[PDB]
Design a protein around this motif. Sequence first.
Motif, PDB file in Angstrom:
ATOM      1  N   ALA A   1      67.121  44.454 123.107  1.00 35.48           N
ATOM      2  CA  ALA A   1      67.343  44.230 124.532  1.00 35.48           C
ATOM      3  C   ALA A   1      66.671  42.919 124.986  1.00 35.48           C
ATOM      4  O   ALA A   1      67.174  42.230 125.884  1.00 35.48           O
ATOM      5  CB  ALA A   1      66.841  45.404 125.344  1.00 35.48           C
ATOM      6  N   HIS A   2      65.551  42.557 124.356  1.00 37.34           N
ATOM      7  CA  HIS A   2      64.748  41.454 124.871  1.00 37.34           C
ATOM      8  C   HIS A   2      64.849  40.175 124.089  1.00 37.34           C
ATOM      9  O   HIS A   2      64.211  40.035 123.050  1.00 37.34           O
ATOM     10  CB  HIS A   2      63.283  41.823 124.935  1.00 37.34           C
ATOM     11  N   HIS A   3      65.598  39.226 124.638  1.00 42.23           N
ATOM     12  CA  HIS A   3      65.880  37.967 123.962  1.00 42.23           C
ATOM     13  C   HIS A   3      64.833  36.877 124.237  1.00 42.23           C
ATOM     14  O   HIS A   3      64.696  35.944 123.441  1.00 42.23           O
ATOM     15  CB  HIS A   3      67.289  37.493 124.339  1.00 42.23           C
ATOM     16  N   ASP A   4      64.090  37.013 125.339  1.00 42.26           N
ATOM     17  CA  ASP A   4      63.063  36.031 125.747  1.00 42.26           C
ATOM     18  C   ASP A   4      61.951  35.824 124.715  1.00 42.26           C
ATOM     19  O   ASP A   4      61.470  34.701 124.518  1.00 42.26           O
ATOM     20  CB  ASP A   4      62.411  36.455 127.065  1.00 42.26           C
ATOM     21  N   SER A   5      61.535  36.921 124.084  1.00 40.67           N
ATOM     22  CA  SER A   5      60.472  36.894 123.082  1.00 40.67           C
ATOM     23  C   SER A   5      60.862  36.130 121.798  1.00 40.67           C
ATOM     24  O   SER A   5      60.002  35.507 121.159  1.00 40.67           O
ATOM     25  CB  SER A   5      60.049  38.327 122.741  1.00 40.67           C
ATOM     26  N   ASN A   6      62.147  36.176 121.425  1.00 46.91           N
ATOM     27  CA  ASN A   6      62.630  35.474 120.225  1.00 46.91           C
ATOM     28  C   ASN A   6      62.629  33.963 120.437  1.00 46.91           C
ATOM     29  O   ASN A   6      62.726  33.190 119.483  1.00 46.91           O
ATOM     30  CB  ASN A   6      64.045  35.938 119.852  1.00 46.91           C
ATOM     31  N   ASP A   7      62.500  33.569 121.702  1.00 47.38           N
ATOM     32  CA  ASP A   7      62.564  32.173 122.137  1.00 47.38           C
ATOM     33  C   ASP A   7      61.512  31.242 121.536  1.00 47.38           C
ATOM     34  O   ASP A   7      61.633  30.016 121.653  1.00 47.38           O
ATOM     35  CB  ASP A   7      62.425  32.114 123.660  1.00 47.38           C
ATOM     36  N   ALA A   8      60.464  31.812 120.942  1.00 45.72           N
ATOM     37  CA  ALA A   8      59.427  31.012 120.292  1.00 45.72           C
ATOM     38  C   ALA A   8      59.999  30.465 118.989  1.00 45.72           C
ATOM     39  O   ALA A   8      60.045  29.255 118.768  1.00 45.72           O
ATOM     40  CB  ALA A   8      58.205  31.859 120.014  1.00 45.72           C
ATOM     41  N   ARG A   9      60.425  31.393 118.139  1.00 39.94           N
ATOM     42  CA  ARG A   9      61.164  31.101 116.926  1.00 39.94           C
ATOM     43  C   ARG A   9      62.307  30.129 117.197  1.00 39.94           C
ATOM     44  O   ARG A   9      62.377  29.049 116.602  1.00 39.94           O
ATOM     45  CB  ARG A   9      61.733  32.408 116.379  1.00 39.94           C
ATOM     46  N   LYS A  10      63.209  30.518 118.094  1.00 44.60           N
ATOM     47  CA  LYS A  10      64.332  29.665 118.446  1.00 44.60           C
ATOM     48  C   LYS A  10      63.864  28.235 118.746  1.00 44.60           C
ATOM     49  O   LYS A  10      64.421  27.276 118.211  1.00 44.60           O
ATOM     50  CB  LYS A  10      65.105  30.239 119.639  1.00 44.60           C
ATOM     51  N   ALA A  11      62.842  28.097 119.594  1.00 45.74           N
ATOM     52  CA  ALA A  11      62.351  26.773 120.010  1.00 45.74           C
ATOM     53  C   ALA A  11      61.825  25.977 118.808  1.00 45.74           C
ATOM     54  O   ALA A  11      62.015  24.766 118.705  1.00 45.74           O
ATOM     55  CB  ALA A  11      61.263  26.917 121.065  1.00 45.74           C
ATOM     56  N   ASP A  12      61.145  26.682 117.917  1.00 42.82           N
ATOM     57  CA  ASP A  12      60.672  26.110 116.687  1.00 42.82           C
ATOM     58  C   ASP A  12      61.852  25.590 115.846  1.00 42.82           C
ATOM     59  O   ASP A  12      61.905  24.409 115.477  1.00 42.82           O
ATOM     60  CB  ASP A  12      59.912  27.174 115.908  1.00 42.82           C
ATOM     61  N   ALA A  13      62.793  26.484 115.563  1.00 41.53           N
ATOM     62  CA  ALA A  13      63.984  26.137 114.803  1.00 41.53           C
ATOM     63  C   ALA A  13      64.711  24.935 115.395  1.00 41.53           C
ATOM     64  O   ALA A  13      65.196  24.076 114.658  1.00 41.53           O
ATOM     65  CB  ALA A  13      64.913  27.327 114.726  1.00 41.53           C
ATOM     66  N   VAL A  14      64.774  24.858 116.718  1.00 40.38           N
ATOM     67  CA  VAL A  14      65.442  23.736 117.360  1.00 40.38           C
ATOM     68  C   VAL A  14      64.731  22.434 117.056  1.00 40.38           C
ATOM     69  O   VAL A  14      65.373  21.408 116.847  1.00 40.38           O
ATOM     70  CB  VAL A  14      65.520  23.879 118.896  1.00 40.38           C
ATOM     71  N   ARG A  15      63.402  22.469 117.052  1.00 41.84           N
ATOM     72  CA  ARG A  15      62.621  21.256 116.804  1.00 41.84           C
ATOM     73  C   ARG A  15      62.736  20.850 115.325  1.00 41.84           C
ATOM     74  O   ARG A  15      62.683  19.683 114.999  1.00 41.84           O
ATOM     75  CB  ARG A  15      61.159  21.456 117.232  1.00 41.84           C
ATOM     76  N   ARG A  16      62.917  21.822 114.440  1.00 40.48           N
ATOM     77  CA  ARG A  16      63.074  21.546 113.022  1.00 40.48           C
ATOM     78  C   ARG A  16      64.548  21.315 112.677  1.00 40.48           C
ATOM     79  O   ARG A  16      64.900  20.983 111.542  1.00 40.48           O
ATOM     80  CB  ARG A  16      62.535  22.717 112.200  1.00 40.48           C
ATOM     81  N   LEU A  17      65.409  21.509 113.665  1.00 38.40           N
ATOM     82  CA  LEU A  17      66.839  21.389 113.458  1.00 38.40           C
ATOM     83  C   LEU A  17      67.285  22.353 112.382  1.00 38.40           C
ATOM     84  O   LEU A  17      68.179  22.067 111.601  1.00 38.40           O
ATOM     85  CB  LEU A  17      67.212  19.959 113.074  1.00 38.40           C
TER      86      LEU A  17
END
Length: 297
Positions: free
Chosen positions: A79-95
């Motif tokens: 249900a909670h997508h906001d918490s995954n946003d750390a990982r996501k943000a990391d992955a985005v910076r690493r492309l």
Amino acid sequence: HHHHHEFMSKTDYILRALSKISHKRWEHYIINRVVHTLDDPDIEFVCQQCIRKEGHLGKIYLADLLFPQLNLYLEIDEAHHDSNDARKADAVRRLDIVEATGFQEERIPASNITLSEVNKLVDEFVRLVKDKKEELENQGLFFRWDYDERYSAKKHINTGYMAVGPNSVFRYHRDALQCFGYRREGHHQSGGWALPAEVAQSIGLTGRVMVWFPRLYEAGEWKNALSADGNKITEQSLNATRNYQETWDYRIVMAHSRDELNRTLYRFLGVFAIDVDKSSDEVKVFSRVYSRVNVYR
């Protein structure tokens, strides 16, 4: 007979991938259940890959399991997508983003479910996986996981073309360049490489084409960026002597990305071209023209 350029054996990959830490209640369990009960060492799997979905512009999701050969991923839906946003943000910076164009998406609700129900939904997913494999072994289209060759030119040369997706990623410049007629023994380290004219023409482009290996953040005397949807690149020169006029008709973009252990990979982003009216002598905007490109011979 070791691999001189490898950091990780296939077995180490499998062991770490399955024993990874997670914060989702059901994730570790589902992933292990799937992989262990699937029990097919020829099937490639990737865990926790961030992906883009076609038409969901600038949106980034998380595929808890992804199957490169079968055009298939699994989402364990929390249900909670906001918490995954750390990982996501990391992955985005690493492309560390895979454009999952063409992939069938499956879901398993992470919430309000018994052990018994989870087991059920996973057994179904597994049969669906085995099915996809055979639909393709059946059409002669299935190639067994070739881990030693995962970051090399080999599968692309054999296929004849390449597309944005999980597989069009390269360890070194030379791996990428070998798809486009590079015949040198040596390595290539600079930011660009010109296709010979015979190659450009042969692979179906026109005029002047290069392979660009950009770092899409601020580094050295470039402040570069990739757009949220991954279709535009902006290039800012930080040094006056560096300003130039674009003379390439097409750039084949192999962007610098980094994996979890921070090793460098090059990711095919597509074929780009300069947007003349959006650019200046200081800042250039390149727009994506194709997400796919033929491979030389």
